[PDB]
């Protein structure tokens, strides 16, 4: 199983960002997709997951209005769509994949993350 993260960099605070992650080595369509991050002095934490029947699930506070989760099963890749960033955004952002977890940070598999940073 690989997992790969991409579209992290720099942005300015108010900015929006779109990450994406392509998976190979298991059949897609049948695992749970999700974000996790982990920024400065915090533990790893959820962001969001889609569950492999389309079901979207966020994390607390700045997540179901600022966020949006995708998947597209042709193409075996799934997305982050952020809004609205902030400084305290700044974070590794991981994709990660398992059969049957949504928020628990104990997904299967995981990727080696991408890193943004928002600015003040």
């Known amino acids: 199983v690989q997992l790969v993260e991409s579209g992290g960099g720099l942005v300015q605070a108010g900015d929006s960002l779109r990450l994406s992650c392509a998976a190979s080595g298991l059949t897609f369509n049948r695992y749970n997709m999700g974000w996790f991050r982990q920024a400065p002095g915090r533990e790893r934490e959820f962001v969001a997951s889609?569950?492999?029947?389309?079901?979207?699930?966020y994390g607390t506070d700045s997540v179901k209005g600022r966020f949006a989760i995708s998947r597209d099963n042709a193409k075996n890749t799934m997305y982050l769509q952020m809004n609205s960033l902030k400084p305290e955004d700044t974070a590794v952002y991981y994709c990660?994949?398992?059969?049957?977890?949504?928020?628990?940070?104990?997904?299967?598999?995981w990727g080696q993350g991408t890193q943004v940073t928002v600015s003040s």
């Open positions: 889609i569950s492999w029947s389309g079901d979207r699930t």
């Open positions: 990660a994949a398992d059969r049957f977890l949504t928020r628990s940070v104990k997904y299967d598999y």
